[PDB]
Amino acid sequence: GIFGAIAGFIENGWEGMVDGWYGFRHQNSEGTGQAADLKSTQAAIDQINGKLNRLIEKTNEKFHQIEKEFSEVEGRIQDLEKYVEDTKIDLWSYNAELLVALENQHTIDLTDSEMNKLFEKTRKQLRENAEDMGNGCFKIYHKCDNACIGSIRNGTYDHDVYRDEALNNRFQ
Amino acid sequence: GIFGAIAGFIENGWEGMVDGWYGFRHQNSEGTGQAADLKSTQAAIDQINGKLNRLIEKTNEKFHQIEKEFSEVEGRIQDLEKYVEDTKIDLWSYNAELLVALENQHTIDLTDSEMNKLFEKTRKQLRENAEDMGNGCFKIYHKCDNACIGSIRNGTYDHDVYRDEALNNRFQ
Amino acid sequence: GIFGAIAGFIENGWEGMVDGWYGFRHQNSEGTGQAADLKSTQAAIDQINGKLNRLIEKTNEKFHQIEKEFSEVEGRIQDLEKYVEDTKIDLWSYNAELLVALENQHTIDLTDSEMNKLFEKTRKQLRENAEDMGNGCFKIYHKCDNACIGSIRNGTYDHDVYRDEALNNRFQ
Amino acid sequence: PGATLCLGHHAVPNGTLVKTITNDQIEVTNATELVQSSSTGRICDSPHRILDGKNCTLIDALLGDPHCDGFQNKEWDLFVERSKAYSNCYPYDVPDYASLRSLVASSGTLEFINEDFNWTGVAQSGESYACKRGSVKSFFSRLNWLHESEYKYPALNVTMPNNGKFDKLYIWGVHHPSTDREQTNLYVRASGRVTVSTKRSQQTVIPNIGSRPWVRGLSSRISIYWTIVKPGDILLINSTGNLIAPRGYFKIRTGKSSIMRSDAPIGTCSSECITPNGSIPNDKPFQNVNRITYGACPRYVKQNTLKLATGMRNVPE
Amino acid sequence: PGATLCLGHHAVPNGTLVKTITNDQIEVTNATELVQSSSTGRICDSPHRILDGKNCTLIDALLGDPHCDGFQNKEWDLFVERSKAYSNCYPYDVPDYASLRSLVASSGTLEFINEDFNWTGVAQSGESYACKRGSVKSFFSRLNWLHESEYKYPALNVTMPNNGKFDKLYIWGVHHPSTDREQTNLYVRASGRVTVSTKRSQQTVIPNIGSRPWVRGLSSRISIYWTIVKPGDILLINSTGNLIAPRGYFKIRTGKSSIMRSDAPIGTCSSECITPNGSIPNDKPFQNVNRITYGACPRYVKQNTLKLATGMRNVPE
Amino acid sequence: PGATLCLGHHAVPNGTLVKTITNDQIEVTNATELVQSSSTGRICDSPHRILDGKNCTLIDALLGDPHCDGFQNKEWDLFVERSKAYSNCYPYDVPDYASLRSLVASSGTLEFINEDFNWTGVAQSGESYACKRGSVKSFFSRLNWLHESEYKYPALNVTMPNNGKFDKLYIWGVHHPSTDREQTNLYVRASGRVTVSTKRSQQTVIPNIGSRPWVRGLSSRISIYWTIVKPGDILLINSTGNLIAPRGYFKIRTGKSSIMRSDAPIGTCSSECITPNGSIPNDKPFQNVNRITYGACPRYVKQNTLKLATGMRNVPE
Ligand SMILES: *[C@@H]1O[C@H](CO)[C@@H](O[C@@H]2O[C@H](CO)[C@@H](O[C@@H]3O[C@H](CO[C@H]4O[C@H](CO)[C@@H](O)[C@H](O)[C@@H]4O)[C@@H](O)[C@H](O[C@H]4O[C@H](CO)[C@@H](O)[C@H](O)[C@@H]4O)[C@@H]3O)[C@H](O)[C@H]2NC(C)=O)[C@H](O)[C@H]1NC(C)=O
Ligand SMILES: *[C@@H]1O[C@H](CO)[C@@H](O[C@@H]2O[C@H](CO)[C@@H](O[C@@H]3O[C@H](CO[C@H]4O[C@H](CO)[C@@H](O)[C@H](O)[C@@H]4O)[C@@H](O)[C@H](O[C@H]4O[C@H](CO)[C@@H](O)[C@H](O)[C@@H]4O)[C@@H]3O)[C@H](O)[C@H]2NC(C)=O)[C@H](O)[C@H]1NC(C)=O
Ligand SMILES: *[C@@H]1O[C@H](CO)[C@@H](O[C@@H]2O[C@H](CO)[C@@H](O[C@@H]3O[C@H](CO[C@H]4O[C@H](CO)[C@@H](O)[C@H](O)[C@@H]4O)[C@@H](O)[C@H](O[C@H]4O[C@H](CO)[C@@H](O)[C@H](O)[C@@H]4O)[C@@H]3O)[C@H](O)[C@H]2NC(C)=O)[C@H](O)[C@H]1NC(C)=O
Ligand SMILES: *[C@@H]1O[C@H](CO[C@@H]2O[C@@H](C)[C@@H](O)[C@@H](O)[C@@H]2O)[C@@H](O[C@@H]2O[C@H](CO)[C@@H](O)[C@H](O)[C@H]2NC(C)=O)[C@H](O)[C@H]1NC(C)=O
Ligand SMILES: *[C@@H]1O[C@H](CO[C@@H]2O[C@@H](C)[C@@H](O)[C@@H](O)[C@@H]2O)[C@@H](O[C@@H]2O[C@H](CO)[C@@H](O)[C@H](O)[C@H]2NC(C)=O)[C@H](O)[C@H]1NC(C)=O
Ligand SMILES: *[C@@H]1O[C@H](CO[C@@H]2O[C@@H](C)[C@@H](O)[C@@H](O)[C@@H]2O)[C@@H](O[C@@H]2O[C@H](CO)[C@@H](O)[C@H](O)[C@H]2NC(C)=O)[C@H](O)[C@H]1NC(C)=O
Ligand SMILES: *[C@@H]1O[C@H](CO)[C@@H](O[C@@H]2O[C@H](CO)[C@@H](O)[C@H](O)[C@H]2NC(C)=O)[C@H](O)[C@H]1NC(C)=O
Ligand SMILES: *[C@@H]1O[C@H](CO)[C@@H](O[C@@H]2O[C@H](CO)[C@@H](O)[C@H](O)[C@H]2NC(C)=O)[C@H](O)[C@H]1NC(C)=O
Ligand SMILES: *[C@@H]1O[C@H](CO)[C@@H](O[C@@H]2O[C@H](CO)[C@@H](O)[C@H](O)[C@H]2NC(C)=O)[C@H](O)[C@H]1NC(C)=O
Ligand SMILES: *[C@@H]1O[C@H](CO)[C@@H](O)[C@H](O)[C@H]1NC(C)=O
Ligand SMILES: *[C@@H]1O[C@H](CO)[C@@H](O)[C@H](O)[C@H]1NC(C)=O
Ligand SMILES: *[C@@H]1O[C@H](CO)[C@@H](O)[C@H](O)[C@H]1NC(C)=O
Ligand SMILES: *[C@@H]1O[C@H](CO)[C@@H](O)[C@H](O)[C@H]1NC(C)=O
Ligand SMILES: *[C@@H]1O[C@H](CO)[C@@H](O)[C@H](O)[C@H]1NC(C)=O
Ligand SMILES: *[C@@H]1O[C@H](CO)[C@@H](O)[C@H](O)[C@H]1NC(C)=O
């Protein structure tokens, strides 16, 4: 939605990722792989669980109220009782329709946010050792084995170790 | 608004663009030009048309209700009828005031989003051949004729073709 | 929140900044310092003051209404009067609960926005003379005295002056 | 040597101000109005069947006030009552007038079915000055003024079964004479009494002889009452004088009919929404024209304008 | 030589459509329903104390209709009135029936306390065909039909103080004979009169002798009335005939009790929310089952479905 | 060799928790309260004109209960009824008491204009023990107890035209004697009758002689009624005994006046919003003090606190 990652500059989702909501796919000298990112998955799921809990809070315990079905024609008083219930239902129906539109728009945008946050966290991490191809992928300009790919996913990647090799591959 | 592009790091709009909402302006060895981007224009217009349609859905067909004008002093029952209508109008008036504030805030932010998305799509595309001057413009570090500018707007720009020339102009 | 700056890629706030909401901290050949950014502080405070004013607008002047306490058992009419007031209070209570949830979510996100806008404005400004370390800090690849740090905060930094020195320090 | 490529957005010289969560006034490139605040001035006669009450209230058309005779057996989706309206028959009051007006307007029909009540012993079709039809003495067309015959008013005990598959609306009344002379001259008994009843109900009226101010020639009055008979039930009327008898029933329908007070002229056009100010389009979600509406209408709000932004923020310079 | 690292999100082949501010239909990876639209079909007898009215309305149980004798002194959180319900006693009407039904249902108890009113001069416990208890003539269990004794009905003037620390609900009535013979045979006076009163109030009923349609053997009727006596006040009854006397009081409580019209069978289960359709879970915030609810219930809305997105946008291909 | 430039935001050690769409509790740097939950305890006598009813209800001030004489011809924006209030005149009831109280409170004035009704044939200003003014027998100041003169009560037929350009509110009553002796001693007729009327309306009261409990020395009662006369209409009173006559009219106004039940002391201060708990500031949009308000008030909600974040998220460590 609003951030342009999901349904945006990322082409489509990964149906084979069944262990997380966001993750990494790589190709290197050792093969190809897929790994979920738990940080971003928990971030999105926690906020959605947060709004689920805000909605089960409801405090609508009602007992003796007004009559809402009538078998006899009575006139004024019945007109008012019917009008009151019709007025109440229309306003609550509006509240429900507005609530889902707000919540769903915000849900789509917040998941789009989490995707972009994982991207940016990864982008800044690689420093001058990689470039953004624009499709949600980085070309890594050095040999980066499974431990190296691991280091990126786990946040322990030391860009200074590979900087000279990557700079030389980048700039002719 | 929230993304800092419109009314933000972009200085102002282009009053001479009458064929699109977002677009490109260039200066090269062949002259200067202006071209609208249809992708981003349609994206913004579609979402705004979407909320227009969500608002013409209204389902307020009412027939026999309660009386709302009175020529005689009656007391309790009239007090209640007046209170009911006053209560209903205040709540719907609030719904209308809140709806426009939410919708307009979201409209401004979503157009700000589309502007930034076009920027980022263009930024990633140019790779190491251009730099962000911070005012919504890129300095392109190589000869880039009208076909070259065309290729950027149309998404077919091959940065590898110009990479050596641009890198040499960038780095002393 | 949604932008990942505050409570995100920035580790925590600066409790010693009592003259602004956003700002700069630096280390250079002359020492270390802290300076608030008035642009971004005013931007956030103005929008929050804007929503404060939108909320003090309230137009709830009511005079003769309906009775809401009863010492005698009356039945139908009293049932309706009680139901009307209970219905009204539940809907306004919902409006108040929804309003703060929307406003507070938007407040957190808009302050997160202003933080990111100051970051990006600074990032584009430095051009090829600095790099993002990912923690809200830039490594400046040249000698940058207090006047130089001043120039960045004040928007008058000329990256062309230092470009050759920074490029040479960047790239081996 | 290189090139420059700038990203930008459009702008207009005549932006429009809207409200947001944050800003009391902020200029956008375009906006549209969400509050309907104008009317054409006529009530469109389509798509709803409109019945102009003209000089007649619904109650006078129901009872049969002579200048309302053109309203016999009519149907409507919306009955339009004019402020010019006036009564020109016997002076009357209706206890719970508003409820009777509402239920007949909600039923949406003046269909009257004559039934032959068994009025042996009294003389029917009593008439009066106050209710001219042309230049002759007359009475409410749907009411039957019973008075004594050959100097007696025997204990009436009349029944009418509802064996049909719909509800019956019966309209009847009680005469209140001005003086004791009148009471005995018409009903021959010093005190009258009227008891209409069903299996559920019983409404008994005692007439109260006395003075009321001069209205259309008379100090006498009539009180109007109604009884609804359900299928399988039966109408029983027992009266020892002063009964203003029904001549039949009105059939009660359920539907979308109602009533509206308006002086707006009836025009030949089509519009789903009707207000006392006239018909209004319903293309906008809200309206500030009138709290009173009928049909598919925008919801009434107190604001006269609400601008919905339909474009980005306008940054001219 | 290098490597490629791609960032991505998950997707599912069976996404679900939801509504947003911008989109009438947009596919997300998962959603949950917020509108409850189904019921099990039974009303759970827990956690609320449910009293099945069965063949009896609340009013008939209160008065003491013989086929309602099993409802004596009962309490309830929810009284369930069945459409099968019928009266099988003396034909009656209750002016403002709805209010009496509401206040007794809100009180939530049929606790009756007998009190010894001082009825010297008249014969108590008048009975009738229309109200068989078994095969013998009987009457409303909570009402005392007073008629003349040894050919007189003396001016009754009876008092009853409320010296307790709670409110008293007194139920009484007025008999409407069919003919003048009846009136004098039972009450020995051509016109009756009943005046119950407190320090605040005075409700006087005049009986109106006349014909009403045949119901359970009789053309006679009874009108039912109530008076609430506050602590320190006193009940005074003055009647010269036609009084249907109370035998005591019902104690009025305040609480969470109510009444509901339903034909749903009573089941042994637990559910906080009750509808006429049956009990429903309250785990969702909204419901489309019935505008009538009791207990901790989802709020009724007109929509039958509202999908809340619980996952990101689904982009399969 | 280089430099480091860090971007950051402020933080405070004493953050505050607020609610969002996503979070039940989240710490922000600052917040402000939107629910008013406290009161000073006094009702400010500015800017609204406040009239402390003290020992008098509005109805007793209207009728003219002797200990309410200080309330003659007063005006108010808010009439404050105290729970100490008591009646100390003739025992009375008002059918539809609440409506009379409401319409007089909404009118906002006790302006009484004396008019010379033509009471030839009866003796005026009947008085009683139950209504001492000082130590002498007296009566309601605005009511005129008519009783027979030289042993007769002739058929009163009195009129009063409304030729002014405003509405007239007439207050009158009916006496209910305790015994038949009383009835003939005061009115000389075994049964009274009162018929006040306009061109629209007619309210006839029959007095019902009988016993009511001892209140301030008497078992007798009076029933209070009202009639509103429109310009060009006329008031006609016809009574054959038991009439409690009006001495004039109250003028009805339309405006911002009302009534409130409160024991809060009246203070000298200024506050737009009034509650029974006392005046409250209206700088916050919501309030939890009382569902009953008057003036420019925050809207009542069930929450006692709602924190609006006025700063960013607080990240101390
Ligand atoms: C209790 O007391 C009231 C009055 O206090 C009595 O009611 C009055 O009854 C008389 C009838 O005798 C009424 O008098 C009549 O008034 C008519 C209406 O006049 C108004 O309207 C016309 C225009 O329509 C104006 O010109 C006029 O100024 C008034 O505004 C008159 O039109 C009548 O006059 C005509 O007829 C008589 C013949 O009867 C002729 O003498 C006249 O010259 C003229 O041709 C007539 O005068 C009076 O209006 C009633 N008043 C009220 C308030 O109702 C009750 O009858 C009495 N009760 C008992 C039991 O006695
Ligand atoms: C004013 O006028 C009304 C009628 O216009 C009088 O009210 C009628 O009173 C008579 C009583 O004499 C009623 O007649 C009785 O009706 C009973 C009910 O019949 C209905 O229900 C049964 C099934 O329950 C059906 O079979 C039947 O078709 C009807 O649907 C009958 O059961 C009675 O008949 C039995 O008793 C009599 C002995 O009294 C025998 O002769 C019969 O053969 C049979 O054994 C009986 O016929 C009549 O229903 C009343 N009508 C109404 C509308 O109320 C008023 O009395 C009168 N007022 C005055 C003051 O006179
Ligand atoms: C129908 O029946 C009722 C009673 O069942 C009758 O109403 C009673 O009428 C008598 C009048 O004779 C009332 O008796 C009077 O009660 C007064 C009030 O007493 C209460 O309040 C005082 C304090 O104010 C307390 O001391 C007392 O305990 C009560 O709480 C007394 O003050 C009167 O006594 C004084 O006057 C008499 C002289 O009349 C002296 O004999 C006494 O010693 C003393 O000086 C008096 O006793 C009685 O309260 C009424 N009861 C009710 C329930 O209303 C009806 O009259 C009757 N109807 C008919 C038609 O007969
Ligand atoms: C699809 O619908 C709901 C929602 O999924 C939940 O919300 C996500 C944000 C994340 O928290 C998921 O792990 C959740 O499953 C699921 O139904 C709920 O499931 C939870 C846990 O399994 C359970 O405790 C609740 O009772 C369920 N709530 C409701 C209202 O049914 C459901 O399992 C999801 N299915 C899939 C395939 O994703
Ligand atoms: C300004 O007001 C409305 C809104 O503009 C529309 O919304 C934009 C997001 C985009 O979709 C534009 O192309 C639209 O014009 C315009 O009025 C509507 O115009 C449409 C199409 O021209 C027409 O079908 C509708 O009937 C109009 N709706 C209403 C409510 O009037 C209007 O033309 C705009 N004017 C300018 C100069 O932009
Ligand atoms: C914390 O609560 C309020 C809100 O702070 C204001 O909003 C910020 C966005 C920014 O505008 C701050 O400068 C504001 O202080 C403060 O109370 C308000 O203070 C203003 C100005 O000092 C005053 O005019 C108002 O009357 C106050 N409003 C209310 C409702 O009390 C308060 O001072 C803040 N305190 C701190 C320590 O930040
Ligand atoms: C509607 O009423 C008006 C006014 O009451 C009628 O116009 C009057 O008609 C009377 C008939 O007796 C004439 O004597 C007058 O000349 C008219 N006066 C005025 C002021 O108009 C009109 O005829 C009625 N129209 C319909 C259609 O019923
Ligand atoms: C509830 O009512 C039903 C129907 O009124 C009762 O069933 C009838 O009982 C009568 C008793 O006189 C029998 O004569 C009939 O055989 C039954 N008829 C029908 C159609 O059921 C039932 O007994 C009542 N049940 C309870 C628990 O009160
Ligand atoms: C308001 O009422 C109180 C209590 O009713 C009055 O105080 C009483 O005044 C009476 C007058 O007859 C005295 O006999 C008592 O001594 C007082 N008793 C109590 C308990 O206060 C007070 O005077 C009234 N005040 C006003 C302003 O009307
Ligand atoms: C009408 O009433 C008369 C008198 O009571 C009676 O003779 C007659 O049978 C009744 N029915 C009809 C149809 O005339
Ligand atoms: C509509 O008519 C009412 C009176 O019926 C008037 O107060 C209001 O101003 C009118 N509004 C418009 C928009 O004509
Ligand atoms: C009951 O009434 C009789 C007759 O009025 C009377 O004699 C008796 O004292 C009263 N009280 C009791 C307890 O019987
Ligand atoms: C519930 O019952 C009502 C009638 O009482 C019916 O109209 C409605 O369709 C039912 N709804 C469900 C969900 O069973
Ligand atoms: C008052 O009434 C008397 C008796 O009916 C009558 O003589 C007199 O004219 C009337 N009017 C006035 C002003 O006294
Ligand atoms: C206000 O008074 C009411 C009773 O009148 C009481 O229930 C409530 O707690 C009070 N609230 C405050 C804030 O004083």
Author numbering:
A (entry chain B), B (entry chain B), C (entry chain B): 1 to 172
D (entry chain A), E (entry chain A), F (entry chain A): 9 to 325
What does the paper behind this entry write?
Interestingly, from the late 1970s through to the early 1990s (strains Bgk/79 to Shn/93), a marked decreased in binding to N-linked and biantennary O-glycans containing only one or two LacNAc repeats beneath the terminal sialoside is evident. Position 159 is present as a serine (S) in post-pandemic H3 HAs, evolving subsequently to a tyrosine (Y) or structurally similar phenylalanine (F) from the mid 1980s. Crystal structures of HK/68, Bgk/79 (A/Bangkok/1/1979), and Bei/89 (A/Beijing/353/1989) HAs reveal a generally conserved pattern of either 7 or 8 H-bonds connecting N5 of SIA to the backbone O of residue 135, O1A of SIA to the Oγ of Ser136, O1B of SIA to the backbone N of residue 137, the side-chain OH of Tyr98 to O8 and/or O9 of SIA, and a combination of the side-chains of His183, Glu190, and Ser228 to O9 of SIA. Thus, while binding interactions along the length of glycan receptors potentially favoring selection of extended glycans do appear to occur in early H3 HAs, such interactions appear transient and poorly conserved.
IAV strains are named according to the antigenic similarity or serotype of two major viral surface glycoproteins, hemagglutinin (HA or H) and neuraminidase (NA or N), which also play key roles in binding and release, respectively, from receptors on airway epithelial cells. Influenza HAs bind sialic acid (N-Acetylneuraminic acid, NeuAc) containing glycans (sialoglycans) on cell surface glycoproteins and glycolipids as their primary biological receptors. Previously, we and others have demonstrated that over time, IAV HAs within the human H3 subtype have evolved more complex receptor specificity, selecting for elongated α2–6 sialoglycans featuring at least three linear LacNAc (galactose linked β1–4 to N-acetylglucosamine, Galβ1–4GlcNAc) repeats beneath the terminal species-defining sialoside moiety. By utilizing a variety of structural techniques, we provide evidence that this enhanced mode of receptor-binding has evolved over many years to include mutations outside the traditionally defined sialic acid receptor-binding site (RBS).
